[PDB]
Design a protein around this nucleic acid. Sequence first.
DNA 1: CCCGGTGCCGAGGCCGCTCAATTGGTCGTAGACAGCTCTAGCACCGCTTAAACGCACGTACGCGCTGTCCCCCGCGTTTTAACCGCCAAGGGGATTACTCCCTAGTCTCCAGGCACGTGTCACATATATACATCCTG
DNA 2: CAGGATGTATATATGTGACACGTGCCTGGAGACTAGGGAGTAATCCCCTTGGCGGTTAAAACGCGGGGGACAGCGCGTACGTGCGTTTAAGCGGTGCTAGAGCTGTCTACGACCAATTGAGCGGCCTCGGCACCGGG
Lengths: 187, 81, 80, 95, 48, 94, 96, 105, 108
Amino acid sequence: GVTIVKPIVYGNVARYFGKKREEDGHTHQWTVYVKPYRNEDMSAYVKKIQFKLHESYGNPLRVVTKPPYEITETGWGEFEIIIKIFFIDPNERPVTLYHLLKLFQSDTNAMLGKKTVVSEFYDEMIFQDPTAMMQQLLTTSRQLTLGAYKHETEFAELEVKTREKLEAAKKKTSFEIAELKERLKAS
Amino acid sequence: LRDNIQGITKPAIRRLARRGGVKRISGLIYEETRGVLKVFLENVIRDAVTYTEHAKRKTVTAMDVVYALKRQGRTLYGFGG
Amino acid sequence: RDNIQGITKPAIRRLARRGGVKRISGLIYEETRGVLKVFLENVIRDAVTYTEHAKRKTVTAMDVVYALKRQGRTLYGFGG
Amino acid sequence: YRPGTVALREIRRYQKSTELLIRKLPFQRLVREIAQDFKTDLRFQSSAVMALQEACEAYLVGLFEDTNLCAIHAKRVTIMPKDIQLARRIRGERA
Amino acid sequence: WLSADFAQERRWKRGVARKVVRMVIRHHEEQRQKEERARREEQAKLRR
Amino acid sequence: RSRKESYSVYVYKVLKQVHPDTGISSKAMGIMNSFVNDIFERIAGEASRLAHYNKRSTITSREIQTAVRLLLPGELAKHAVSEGTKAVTKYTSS
Amino acid sequence: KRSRKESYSVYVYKVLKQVHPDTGISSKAMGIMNSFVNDIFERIAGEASRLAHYNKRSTITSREIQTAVRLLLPGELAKHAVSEGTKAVTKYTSSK
Amino acid sequence: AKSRSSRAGLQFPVGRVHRLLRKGNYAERVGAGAPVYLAAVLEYLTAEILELAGNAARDNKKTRIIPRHLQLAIRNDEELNKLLGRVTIAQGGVLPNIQAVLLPK
Amino acid sequence: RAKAKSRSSRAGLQFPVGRVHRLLRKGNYAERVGAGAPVYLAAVLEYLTAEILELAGNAARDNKKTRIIPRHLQLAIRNDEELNKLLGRVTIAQGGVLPNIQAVLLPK
DNA sequence: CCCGGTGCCGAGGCCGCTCAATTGGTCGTAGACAGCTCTAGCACCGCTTAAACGCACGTACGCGCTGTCCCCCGCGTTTTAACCGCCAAGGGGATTACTCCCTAGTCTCCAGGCACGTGTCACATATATACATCCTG
DNA sequence: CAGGATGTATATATGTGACACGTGCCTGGAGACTAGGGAGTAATCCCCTTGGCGGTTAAAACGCGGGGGACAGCGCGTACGTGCGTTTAAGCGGTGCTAGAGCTGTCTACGACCAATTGAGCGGCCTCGGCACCGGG
């Protein structure tokens, strides 16, 4: 009768190189990741995360062993990545997720000139009637870092929400400074 | 932090082997050296943090590292004042 | 005197068996004899150094244990 | 150049100098990584980090010096993983 | 060179004469302690 | 005769507690006594070194705890520390 | 409010200059030198303490230190250090 | 009236441990709980080794711990092995193990 | 009192006999220390230091350097037979190693 | 290697005494804790670029195979001494007597350890031809 | 049997880092001078544990024979080195900020210390039974 819910976010970021590379023809860098929604240490209950890529790469089955779990790579086309999260308790069935690697922007986002492409989704790992060890591990999770933890996608919207503060403060500061300096020098 | 063991690159390991006298190096020697260096740092820093926590200090001083290396048998001069 | 040959070929072979070897070379015995002689010389030197300070005419298993501990070969069974 | 000449050159070059062979900024991050697993928000002194790097470099130099002989024992010039494994086993670290 | 010498010789002299009168007190004490050692010799004959 | 001394009685009591029916020979008892003495020496030396490092003129339960941490490998350290802390807590309550 | 830390650099440089008038020493070399002095001091003092504890004596003496030096120093360095210590203990007790 | 060993619930001689600590020149002031803690750790290690050696000797149809089985336990336990690595148990022997390369077939 | 003479000067040593005695008496080593123990200890330490300094200065002159650096210490230690045995389990920072290339890895 | 019989000396339990552990009582001192601060550790951002990463190519080193030659390995018989008990006595340890050496305390005093500024005093970095020191012909 | 073609020294120079050298501070040390303590040196002397005699078989040793393992020669393959080009984050040092290691000041519980009392431990002794030894399956 014990149900534990762990919120997580899994996704990918991508940066366009501006031109097709001559070495391998790739056009984008991308990082595929799972990270926690809360500021908590996934390593207390995750043994490893395996990411299975498209068969174009020299090895498609990548592995990561510490949170925030992520892999950085390069590519030119979109493909589905299978993320298999294994838990410390071998009696617990690992979780399977399918992430559509997004590298290209939509027309609306392309017109806005945004420097990064992001696709990420929120999910909740549900452990129903978990073992005593697994329950203790899930309940004893510690905080990951003392800093803030945040989410990115819709990237254009988050960037606009950031700039709505940033440019306002910058313009205020700029104009106020210019006025102060000019008045003081005129006297 | 994470995956900072990869901050020990193939040129660095090859220079460390050149300084040890090795002429030709294999491919998996780099992974073996990273794994061995990580295991060594694990014990050294565990001893250092054990000497630190016991002192109720928030900073790992150089004397803590010196004492850890002495415990592990690697007496290190040049950092004992 | 030169009674170092007391550690004979069959004794060295039995030591090798206990160490897990199933085949010995022809030049291993003269090397094992020298290695054992150096190890002894060292341990006995430490034991005699302890005994001289102790002012005892008889070398003791306690002095042997102290010598072994100094050399790092800690031994249990003889009171230390 | 013939394979091996530029390598013996680097051998003679790095067996002559004494500077650190591992990069500071990358090695300090590894040190802080390994310290995170023991204490959160842990501070380190520059002298402590330098001592750690020196100890690591000396240990690795000794390990490679033993691995060189382990490889030469098998009439081989290239050091293979079993060489470092035998070195560690006979040292007593993974016996 | 000589100024510090006199200052040093003064502290040395008052120290030297000091320890002199000093062993003088210990000597007189040693005479009473000499009688006490004779008493201890009497006690040693007692013990024998 | 003199009075050579050993933990034989307490070793035998712990042996009875762990295996009520399994005895121990004299050679084994002497080896166990030597092991206990060596571990005592090592732990006390490490505690004195910790005291000298911290500039403390006294070896306390915390010093002994840190010395045991600096010597026992992992699970053994975690169990010995728990045993020592429980023993000291039960002692402080009497 | 000063936090002054001691060291053997004042005497390690005196011996250095008396055994080599023209040669100096850097600060890092002086630190390594002081570390060596501290390490060997600890070694010899611990060995003398061990000898005293084995002989059931609560005080360390010149004889314990001599046997400790004989045990620690190897071969033809032990003899030299022991002769130096013996000569010093005899020139010190002669009121010179 | 009450021995500190029984007070703390230990079997080892807390008092003898305190005496040895204060007489071994380890420090000028032995804490009240330092000897209790040390005796507890020693008792824990002794119980571990005794249990292992007991059930190693009883695994060979015996009913009396011997040096052979003490050594077997010390070398089979990965923790006790790291602890007593450079230690040699007299009359303990070695572990039965033959390399595959030496083995036939 | 009489002009105070230091124990180091009385013996003929440079290392601090007073500080050595302080360490010995307040340390784990023993309850109380005799007057002869710290003198002997300081003399031995001074001898070891003089020896290693001579070797380091020789290495420095060989390398054409006036300042003894950790290179001249490492080279001296690993070239000397007995000092190498004394400091075998001791690593020196920025000291380096010897150019000991195995004869089997040379051009043929 | 496993099983039933006999056998013995070493394990384990009891007796008794004493010396260490314990109980009670005191002083003081190192420490626990709060107050203050100022260094150094942390974070960040930009100009520079040296090192790292990726890829091509082939050359030399791993590695697998084969063949000879012998140098250990198993077995039989032959020769030496390790091993298991007695018998002096030479040392290792109890017991008593006693003194040189160190402890403890308190002044008196030479000496070294930095804060600071000043003046020398290496050799790291830079520059170039001289010397190997290759390697493809 | 050369020579472009690299790489590695060798020597010289200079000016900024760092040894090097006063100038006075003082506070933690270093020694001198009485008084008190104490443990180990020294001389006996009782008592076990060595070192020294003659046999018994058990292991060391010597030999033999052939067999399987070491070592050398050789060749196939591939991967590990070197060079070139692209890429990245490492080194620099410039600025901003505050966190806590460290100094400091006060008040206090814990432990060394000393004296008396008590029983836990240990030498000693004896009875006994777990495993050493052994011959048939």
